Amino acid sequence: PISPIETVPVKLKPGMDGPKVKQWPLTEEKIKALVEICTEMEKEGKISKIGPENPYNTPVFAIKSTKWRKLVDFRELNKRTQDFWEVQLGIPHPAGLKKKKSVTVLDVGDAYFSVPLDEDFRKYTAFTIPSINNETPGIRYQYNVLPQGWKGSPAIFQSSMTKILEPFRKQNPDIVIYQYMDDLYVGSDLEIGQHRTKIEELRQHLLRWGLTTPQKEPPFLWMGYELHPDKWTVQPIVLPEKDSWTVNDIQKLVGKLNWASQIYPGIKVRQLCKLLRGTKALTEVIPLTEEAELELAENREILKEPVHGVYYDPSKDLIAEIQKQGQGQWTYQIYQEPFKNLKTGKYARMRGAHTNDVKQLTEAVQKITTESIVIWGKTPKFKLPIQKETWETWWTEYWQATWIPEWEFVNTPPLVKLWYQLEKEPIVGAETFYVDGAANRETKLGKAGYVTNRGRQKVVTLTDTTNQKTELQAIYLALQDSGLEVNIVTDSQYALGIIQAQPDQSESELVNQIIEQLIKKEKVYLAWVPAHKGIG
């Protein structure tokens, strides 16, 4: 059938005219196939024979079981067609779904061909079955329905389907219908009997609108998930056992672990991912480092027992728990009743060159907060491995604003803590180092040194360096040579910036070494002075 629904109006891009691609010549069998197909389509009203008045064309062809298919190549019409709203701005997450008694999938048969095209547009869909060796006038058709491979078809179909479902939805609030391409997933809390009845009424309603439909039973494979009516999990994950790992094997392995990490707690991929780093051939063999091999083993153990997630009960709070796995790796679980996870996840991204665990935890929390609002429309209650005192110490002193929803301390080591503090005031009875660092732009040479109030003085030389590096070196110098307590005067806003953020991890080894020092100290006061103003 062809839905009795209103059509969606459609226009070419401003300025643009309909396509006019010349039909290439087809072999006789291809020509024969298309003629039979277009005759059948014509009979059902899918297409219409058209006159020589219609100046637009798009190349059609035919491909090979010994069934033939008509491929209309819409490259040109597509790039001359208007933009449409996006079909889906997002995909539901199973963890967001509410538990259901019974669930049914109906697939719409011949979806696009069952929806009418805007009459004012059909002309641009004109195509031409060539004659043998292209000697006579082709046979010319235009579409009456949504063409396969045309730009506007996914959207107009989905809109048409939505428009159609609206009545049934309104007359059936307690029923859940999810539109995905040309499937409908239908869920309810009815007992099977009244359910299969509601399902028949839905069909009958679809039929009155030009949409035929079957029936598959659970579990449903969809978007890499496996959906049951009371639990969900990811598609079956099989980790290859092999002696040699190519870049492409490792990529696919990281992809499967990342996907599995939605519901299998504590999946790790840092060490696997380190292998990928570098310029590297798809086919190139990468021997697994020991840590990578340890990672593979742990995930291997994690993945043995099948794990499923529960569905969402909107009458209950969401609890989100985060744990540090180390090396900037964080893992989390989200449950409403301990410990029946709706979902799990991980966070590992480095934001900046230098951070500490408090900053990282806060980012993890932020990522989880956003994700919860999408999936459940509310934020979770957090259980974090950090003392309230630690956290409020840091974020009141820090210059960035922050705010994380309701949370509370949970004792799950490693705990997150600041590993040093910088003094608020000059320290009395400790050496003041006036440090200084600089690099000749022309030669890469650099001197880094200091002068103290106790007459100590030292100057090293560095090679292939930069002002930034030499200023860090000078601060590092003063930390090595000084006692457990020390004041340090630098003109580098740059080094000052980095160190005042109490980094505990960094991409620069200099900065890691400086971090070594700072943790070892008992008191450090850092002061900045304007450069060249002849201060000390």
Partner 1 sequence: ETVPVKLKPGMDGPKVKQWPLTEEKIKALVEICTEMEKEGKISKIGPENPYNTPVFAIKKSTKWRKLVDFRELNKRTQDFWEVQLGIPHPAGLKKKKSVTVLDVGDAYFSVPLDEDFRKYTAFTIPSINNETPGIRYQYNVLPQGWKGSPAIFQSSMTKILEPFRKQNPDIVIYQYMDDLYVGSDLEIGQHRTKIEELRQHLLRWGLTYELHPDKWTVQPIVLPEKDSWTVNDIQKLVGKLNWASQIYPGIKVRQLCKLLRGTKALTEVIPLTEEAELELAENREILKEPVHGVYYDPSKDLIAEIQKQGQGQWTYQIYQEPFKNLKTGKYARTNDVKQLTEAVQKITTESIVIWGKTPKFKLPIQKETWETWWTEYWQATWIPEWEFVNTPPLVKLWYQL
Residue ranges at the known binding site for Mg(2+): 107, 182-183, 436, 471, 491
Task: Please enumerate in sequence order all residues whose Cβ is within 8 A of that of 422, keeping only pairs 6 or more positions apart, or say none.
Answer: 499, 500, 502, 518, 524, 525, 526
Q: Which partner, ligand IB1, partner 1, none, binds residue 402 by CB below 5 to 8 Å per kind?
A: partner 1
Phi then psi for residue 513, to 5 deg, are -65, -40
Nearer to ligand IB1, 272 or 310 (CB): 310
Q: How far apart are CA 366 and CA 164, in angstroms?
A: 39
Contact 468, 499 (CB under 8 A): no
Q: Which partner, ligand IB1, partner 1, none, binds residue 221 by CB below 5 to 8 Å per kind?
A: none
Q: Which partner, ligand IB1, partner 1, none, binds residue 115 by CB below 5 to 8 Å per kind?
A: none
Nearest-approach distance from CB 171 to ligand IB1, in angstroms: 17
Q: Which partner, partner 1, ligand IB1, none, binds residue 229 by CB below 5 to 8 Å per kind?
A: ligand IB1
Nearer to partner 1, 9 or 137 (CB): 9
Q: Report the candidate in 157, 182, 154, 142 with the shortest Cα–Cα distance to residue 41.
A: 142
Contact 72, 62 (CB under 8 A): no
Contact 368, 345 (CB under 8 A): yes
Q: How far apart are CA 229 and CA 220, in angstroms?
A: 9
Q: Which partner, partner 1, ligand IB1, none, binds residue 79 by CB below 5 to 8 Å per kind?
A: none
Q: DSSP of 132-164, one letter per residue?
A: GGG-SPPEEEEESBPPTT-TTHHHHHHHHHHHH
Nearer to partner 1, 102 or 487 (CB): 487
Nearer to partner 1, 287 or 403 (CB): 403
Nearer to ligand IB1, 22 or 98 (CB): 98
Q: Which partner, partner 1, ligand IB1, none, binds residue 222 by CB below 5 to 8 Å per kind?
A: ligand IB1
Q: Is the peptide bond before 229 cis (omega within 30 degrees of 0)?
A: no
Nearer to partner 1, 333 or 355 (CB): 355
Nearer to partner 1, 78 or 251 (CB): 78
Nearest-approach distance from CB 100 to ligand IB1, in angstroms: 4
Nearer to ligand IB1, 29 or 201 (CB): 201
Nearer to partner 1, 432 or 505 (CB): 432
Decide the pairing of beta strands 505-506 and 485-490.
unpaired
Nearest-approach distance from CB 343 to partner 1, in angstroms: 12
Nearest-approach distance from CB 195 to partner 1, in angstroms: 19
Nearest-approach distance from CB 91 to ligand IB1, in angstroms: 8
CB-count burial class (<10 Å; 0-12, 13-18, 19+) for 116: buried
CA quadruple 511, 513, 514, 520: dihedral sign:
positive
Looking from the CA of 221 toward its CB, the CA atoms found within 13 Å total 3
Nearest-approach distance from CB 97 to ligand IB1, in angstroms: 4
Q: How far apart are CA 204 and CA 104, in angstroms?
A: 15
Nearest-approach distance from CB 367 to partner 1, in angstroms: 7
Q: Which partner, partner 1, ligand IB1, none, binds residue 427 by CB below 5 to 8 Å per kind?
A: partner 1
Q: Which partner, partner 1, ligand IB1, none, binds residue 218 by CB below 5 to 8 Å per kind?
A: ligand IB1
Decide the pairing of beta strands 102-107 and 69-72.
unpaired
Coil vs helix vs strand at 353: coil
Nearest-approach distance from CB 513 to partner 1, in angstroms: 23
Residues in the site for ligand IB1, rule: CB under 6 A?
A: 92, 97-98, 100, 103, 176, 178, 180, 185, 187, 218, 220, 222, 227-229, 311
Nearest-approach distance from CB 435 to partner 1, in angstroms: 11
- State the DSSP H helix or E strand holding residue 342, giving kind and residue range, or none if neither: strand 341-347
Nearer to partner 1, 311 or 335 (CB): 311
Q: In DSSP terms, which residues pair with 221 in a beta bridge?
A: 226
Q: Which partner, partner 1, ligand IB1, none, binds residue 90 by CB below 5 to 8 Å per kind?
A: partner 1
Residue 380: alpha-carbon gap to chain centroid: 20
Q: DSSP of 368-385, one letter per residue?
A: HHHHHHHHHSSPPEEEES
Coil vs helix vs strand at 526: strand
Task: Please enumerate in sequence order all residues whose Cβ is within 8 A of that of 84, keeping only pairs 6 or more positions apart, or say none.
Answer: 151, 152, 155, 156
Nearest-approach distance from CB 359 to ligand IB1, in angstroms: 35
Q: Which partner, ligand IB1, partner 1, none, binds residue 483 by CB below 5 to 8 Å per kind?
A: none
Contact 396, 424 (CB under 8 A): no
Q: How far apart are CA 23 and CA 8, in angstroms?
A: 29
Q: DSSP of 7-48, one letter per residue?
A: PPP--B-TT----BPPPPP--HHHHHHHHHHHHHHHHTTSEE
